[PDB]
Amino acid sequence: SQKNGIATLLQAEKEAHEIVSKARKYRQDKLKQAKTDAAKEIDSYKIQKDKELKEF
């Protein structure tokens, strides 16, 4: 029987599922890091505005 073909197909599907999960996790991490960078940039803009207010 085609046990080798069955095993190859199953392993390929498992590896593809693992790769999909890893890619989803990487995209989520990129979104979280970009949100953190956006928050840091907003805080820096607020700090620059506060420094401008202190200079005023």
Partner: protein, 147 residues
């Protein structure tokens, strides 16, 4: 009580009417279908059997034929019966349209059964449950009617 006993006997008769495989009625209670290598596939589950008009063990060979691309399934199987040709084919739902086409493009109409372990065990024990219902109906109603 007599009605209950008759209903239990009818249930037992219906359970026993199911031919043990090789026909439109499967032998999932006492066949090698759920425990075969067709149990789980890469992205589907393989389930197929037939009553071939050519010879027994045909559905096992037919999977090894060109139909293996008609459904991403491939597995060994031990399914045979001399009187009525028995076998098991491999077909995956990842090509469910093509799998159904491969099951229909033969002398046998589509014929598959639940290979899940829990469902298989429940189906196998359903006959025992019907037999026990008949036996308990006998034991209870016979004594009650004697009284």
């Amino acid at each position: 009580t007599y009605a209950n006993y008759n209903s239990a006997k009818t249930n037992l008769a219906a359970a026993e009417r199911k031919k043990t495989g090789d026909l439109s009625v499967r032998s999932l209670h006492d066949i090698v279908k759920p425990e075969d290598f067709v149990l789980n596939s890469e992205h589907l589950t393989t389930v197929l059997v037939a009553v071939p008009k050519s010879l027994k063990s045909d559905f096992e060979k037919s999977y090894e034929t060109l139909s293996k691309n008609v459904v991403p399934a491939s597995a060994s199987v031990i399914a045979e019966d001399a009187e009525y040709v028995l076998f098991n084919v491999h077909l995956f739902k990842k090509n469910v349209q093509e799998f159904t086409t491969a099951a229909r493009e033969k002398k046998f109409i589509p014929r598959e059964f639940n290979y899940s372990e829990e469902l298989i065990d429940q189906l196998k024990k359903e006959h025992d449950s019907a037999a026990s219902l008949e036996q308990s109906l006998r034991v209870q109603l016979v004594r009650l009617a004697k009284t």
